[PDB]
From Swiss-Prot, chain A:
Lineage of origin: Bacteria, Bacillati, Bacillota, Bacilli, Bacillales
Molecular function GO terms recorded: structural constituent of ribosome
Zinc keyword on record: no
Any single biological process term in GO: translation
Subunit structure: Part of the 50S ribosomal subunit.
InterPro entries recorded: Bacterial_rp_bL28, Ribosomal_bL28, Ribosomal_bL28/bL31-like_sf, Ribosomal_bL28_bact-type, Ribosomal_bL28_sf
Alphabetically ordered keywords of this record: Ribonucleoprotein, Ribosomal protein
Stated name of the protein: Large ribosomal subunit protein bL28
Family from the record: Belongs to the bacterial ribosomal protein bL28 family.
Natural source organism: Bacillus subtilis (strain 168)
Signal peptide: none
Length: 58, 69
RNA sequence: UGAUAUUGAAUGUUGGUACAGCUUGUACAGGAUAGGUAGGAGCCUUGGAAACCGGAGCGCCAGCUUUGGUGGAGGCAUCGGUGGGAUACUACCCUGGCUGUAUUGACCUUCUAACCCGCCGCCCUUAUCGGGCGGGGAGACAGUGUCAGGUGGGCAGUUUGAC
RNA sequence: UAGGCCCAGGCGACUGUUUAGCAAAAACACAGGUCUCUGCGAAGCCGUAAGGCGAAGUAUAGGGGCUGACGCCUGCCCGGUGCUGGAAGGUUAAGAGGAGCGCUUAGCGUAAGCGAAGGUGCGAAUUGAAGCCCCAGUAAACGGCGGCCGUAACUAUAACGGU
RNA sequence: CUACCCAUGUCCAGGGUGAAGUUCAGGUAACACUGAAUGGAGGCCCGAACCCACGCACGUUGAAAAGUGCGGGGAUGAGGUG
């Protein structure tokens, strides 16, 4: 699970409360699924919403 | 014997536009019979067999909430 | 449970953002209830004008050089303007207002290309997986990502004084 | 080789299951009863997700809670808590919205200070969901079924009247 | 090993009791029913194999790190077992 264009992933980090007591946690990447041309073949893959902002076709 | 007539729904202001759409969108749920069009609303009134007086009472009610009950 | 991205189109109702317009200056005062600084006398006559009321203007409505109507055929500047202006025009501008404009949002619908279908037909193929092409259903919702608020012994880490 | 029997009570209806190795039962289970959730990709459950069980079932079905054959029955209380439902109002985050105020310096400077643009901080009003505050129902839901004074035997049955 | 589940096999000497139904009769209004014959149901009865573990005694550096002896319970089923 990762964007096929920019290669974003999901990372790990803490999660603080009011009293700063830590605990593990994860950070998703806002991926979407769209039919897209790839290496001369159309396909539906994962791609981040940020990449979709500009400079891409569907 | 048709406790309510179609002309009653007509005069109630239940014909198209936006105000009448709000009228039905309110009245229906106030009677627990969901949404409909004019004819569909009349048919629902008929099938659930609801009494005229309660219909008028809810009518006045929703007009009051429209007028700020 | 909200905001925000994915996330589109057409409405309608809608609050405003500026454009465009003609506007009452009521002061207990000038014949008279004639703004703000103002150049200031020159204009108007077959704009039935000036006497004039309301219909741009306020209103217990009085009248206004603007103004559809009979109210008919000159005042103002110049005339005690009690005046906190003396006004041809108004070089510039404001309250009485809505329209078309640029709107922007918020609602209320509608639609269809997004996204979804443990629906159907055909193909890959001998396959209840999968995806490819058609149909259908829903549809900018839902699902998913980030942020926020509730609830939360369901599950964790701990405390519970001395004489 | 091969049933001691009878008369009374308590508990549990019955056959069954249970602490391998100190407890075999009155404990558990059960046929029946009742309450409640679930319109199908059902509810619930396992898994982070795919994927499954439920079920190749469809409310005469499935999950959960209490009670526990059969016969006679299950009284009063909705203030509190839980759950279900509703509207006038109050309170409430993130995000929008940014009034206004600081620091810095072109300039004026005159000696003190005032200080245009830009930058950089701080942020007013206005708006902003559920929940909570509130109201109604619900008890084979969690729960509750009193004190005083005067008045009737049997182990004072204080039954009965007044606060 | 033990707990529960899934697929596929297998084991239970012998004897009792006699449900439904059916057929006869009597019976009644036919019915209700009564009595015979047939029939062979059952988480039925008695009891070996098998499974379990209620009482007592013995053993307690044991024959055995949970047994033996004499009695006991279920034994066609919510069975036992490979
Ligand atoms: Mg991957
Ligand atoms: Mg740590
Ligand atoms: Mg949270
Ligand atoms: Mg704890
Ligand atoms: Mg520690
Ligand atoms: Mg001590
Ligand atoms: Mg028992
Ligand atoms: Mg027993
Ligand atoms: Mg034991
Ligand atoms: Mg015993
Ligand atoms: Mg024992
Ligand atoms: Mg039961
Ligand atoms: Mg299945
Ligand atoms: Mg019990
Ligand atoms: Mg009991
Ligand atoms: Mg009771
Ligand atoms: Mg038996
Ligand atoms: Mg045992
Ligand atoms: Mg023995
Ligand atoms: Mg027995």
């Amino acid at each position: 699970r990762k964007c096929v264009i920019t290669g974003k992933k999901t990372t790990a980090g803490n999660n603080r409360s009011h009293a700063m007591n830590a605990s593990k946690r994860t950070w998703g990447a806002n991926l979407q699924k769209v039919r897209i041309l790839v290496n001369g073949k159309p396909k539906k893959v994962y791609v981040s919403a940020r990449a979709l902002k500009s400079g891409k076709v569907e | 014997e048709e406790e309510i007539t179609f002309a009653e729904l007509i005069e109630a202001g239940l014909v198209g536009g936006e105000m009448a759409r709000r009228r039905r969108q309110r009245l229906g749920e106030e009677l627990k019979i969901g949404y409909a069009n004019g004819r569909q609303f009349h048919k629902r009134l008929k099938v659930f067999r609801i009494s005229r007086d309660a219909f008028y009472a809810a009518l006045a009610q929703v007009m009051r909430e429209e007028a700020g009950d």
